[PDB]
């Protein structure tokens, strides 16, 4: 087996309702902004305003108008933060964060404009990965959702709202943390079965 440190520390996939829109964005710099503008060649900006969807309805088009400066993600040390640069609050569903505060795994946190939140922590994940080899393959295999993070730009979902699934929100993304994923790969291969 051969291993290499991943070039991109995370990958973001843009979604509209239940359909994938645009290509997967790979972040190389430790800081990047996901806005609704139209720059196609910026390694620090995932501009969603240029992505087209022929099946886009009215409500999604209105939601794409309020993205503005969007969300800013920086990877300082071993933690991940999401900052709401948009003039509308964002809704994040991070299992690492939900567990960090003892909330239900499906819990969705609202980030008002200007606020931020510690979305992920490598040390926390590494500790959970250690105490998981004692519960079997299943427990370790289900640590893949810990490496995936979902955000919504204007409309929230889950309990307390009418939208119950993330596929109901007009504009939402899904992050994949390559770093944590690589650590998981080392342990999964040795778990057998």
């Amino acid at each position: 087996v051969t291993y290499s440190e991943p070039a991109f520390w995370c990958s973001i996939a843009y979604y509209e309702l239940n359909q994938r829109v645009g290509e997967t964005f790979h972040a190389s710099q430790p800081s990047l902004t996901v806005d609704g503008f139209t720059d196609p060649s910026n390694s620090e900006r995932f501009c969603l305003g240029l992505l087209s969807n022929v099946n886009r309805n009215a409500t999604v088009e209105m939601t794409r108008r309020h993205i503005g400066r969007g969300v800013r993600l920086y990877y300082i040390g071993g933690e991940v933060f999401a900052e709401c640069l948009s003039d509308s609050a964002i809704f994040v569903q991070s299992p690492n964060c939900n567990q960090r505060y003892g909330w239900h795994p499906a819990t969705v946190c609202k980030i008002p404009p200007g606020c931020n939140l510690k979305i992920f922590n490598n040390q926390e994940f590494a500790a959970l990965l250690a105490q998981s080899v004692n519960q079997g393959f299943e427990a370790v295999y289900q640590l893949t959702r810990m490496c995936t993070i979902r955000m919504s730009f204007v409309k929230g979902w889950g309990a307390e709202y009418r939208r119950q699934t993330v596929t109901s929100t007009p504009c939402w993304i899904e992050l994949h943390l390559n770093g944590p994923l690589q650590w998981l790969d080392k342990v999964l291969t040795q778990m057998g079965s």
Partner: peptide
Amino acid sequence: PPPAAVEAARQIEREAQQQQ
């Protein structure tokens, strides 16, 4: 717990701890 698996995760914890 598999011996190789726990050791791999044991190395991961030091790598993440070094980051702090």
